Amino acid sequence: MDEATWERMWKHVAKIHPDGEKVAQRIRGATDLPKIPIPSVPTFQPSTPVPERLEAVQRYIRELQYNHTGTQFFEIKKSRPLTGLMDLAKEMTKEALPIKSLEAVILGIYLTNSMPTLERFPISFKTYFSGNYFRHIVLGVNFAGRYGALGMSRREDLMYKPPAFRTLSELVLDFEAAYGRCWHVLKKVKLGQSVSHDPHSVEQIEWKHSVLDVERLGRDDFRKELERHARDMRL
């Protein structure tokens, strides 16, 4: 990144870290730093079951690490044509830098376009904690009629889910329970449509095919709306 953006990152570190000035003076220009291996983009035998491939995809995403630096290294414009977002995903594998949740969703799409028997659809969450609202997103997946997820989060239980849930409702309710355990109340779930496996597609990702107001719907209608969305996607 260019020199001005680099200084901005370190200036931001100075404010958000207790001894922020100390952190930069220990790291900047240091000659003894660890050499970080560039993670190997996983490739797949045709004999490998898709769930096993997904474990390798998630492992790769995890190796990049969650970006806690305070500076997002890849700008994601969500209305860009898919082909542009896939060019960016390729650059993420080249630059091999830490990522956050939305970048992980784009990467997960890029790395599963070779899996036409897998459908991929974004799931975003709006939660409420300590008077304030928080946004999160994962890549929902469907293999052989069972639901799972790929993604990246600060918490282990708000990203990867093996494709074992027999309904979309059960997948989303698992996220809701995980949020509950860290004292977040789930307010909205926004679910997209299946994403094209063509990395040169000019169509946009559809991020908000269903926008579900959890409290206004109530338990049973929340579940029915999730099952309606799952039907919309299968057809």
Partner: peptide, 6 residues
């Protein structure tokens, strides 16, 4: 939209 990144 509303709220910070989780």
């Amino acid at each position: 939209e509303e709220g910070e990144e989780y």
